[PDB]
Amino acid sequence: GSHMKFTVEREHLLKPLQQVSGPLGGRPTLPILGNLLLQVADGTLSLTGTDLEMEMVARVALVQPHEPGATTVPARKFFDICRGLPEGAEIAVQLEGERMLVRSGRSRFSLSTLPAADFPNLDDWQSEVEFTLPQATMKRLIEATQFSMAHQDVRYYLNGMLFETEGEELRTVATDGHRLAVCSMPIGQSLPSHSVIVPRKGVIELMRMLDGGDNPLRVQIGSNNIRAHVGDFIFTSKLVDGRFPDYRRVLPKNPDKHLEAGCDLLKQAFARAAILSNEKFRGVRLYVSENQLKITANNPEQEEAEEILDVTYSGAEMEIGFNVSYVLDVLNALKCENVRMMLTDSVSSVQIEDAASQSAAYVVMPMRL
């Protein structure tokens, strides 16, 4: 069609406009990537946003009369206009020449457009593995590892999150070369083995599309893409093409010593000690002895923090150095009563996990003291 036209309730257009337009803020690579593609056909309005690496498509049912067609319109401006109209407002949209008109009551907006024919599309592909899972399960998997992803590392593949399917479980892995996080959850379906790297921005969009409702999440994974469906929203992302580190070989092989303590008391002791640790290197010293942990921090001003805790420990005495932010990140992600630490020696990685559950594990490499 040449004369796209539709009328929809603001109520029905607002959450879809947010789902797709959310990450279309900032400087688009190309001017058209700042626009949303609008398509009207056979009772449906489609709204697409992209950045060339991923795309977000929302479908809105059209109950009132409409004329088919397509155009692109500035995403944020279109969203702000619809959000700014009063509750219960009816929004009438139509192309007029090269402009998109938005009307509601006596409010009239004329928006600039770019041709729908110029809107980029992701390359077609086929899913190799498909499954469903609750939104809460995806959120738990992502929250348990996301903080361990690398921050703009030269090793591009550490900047994303590994998603792995094995047996009845979905697993995430993130590491930045100093610390690693891994979490596995049961999804109730027998699945083939697949391992993919989802880019940083894709992980952010997968989290953003979880509304906390009862709508299930359907996932499809291909060779070079991942796709997630929730209600009438579809998120697609390209995959990072690289070889991710293997977590099974990174987990300490034979931890000699086992320490157990209350998660919160250990977190509050590390948090207080962190105040007087070096602002750049963040080094703290752990001294483990019989049922006792001593945490010490010092900084260039020669200020010192010292925390003594009662813990459960019966191994040999040892001193080990850690970046206190890596330890606090683990303790903050373990939202549990008691935590277990598995040590070997002062120059080897430590494994940290909930003392009750093995669904998540964390590995932190020490620092020289």
């Binding site: 070369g177 100093h178 690693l180 990174v250 590995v363 932190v364 490499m365």
Partner: peptide, 5 residues
């Protein structure tokens, strides 16, 4: 800081 791998 030591490398984990």
């Amino acid at each position: 800081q030591a490398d984990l791998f």
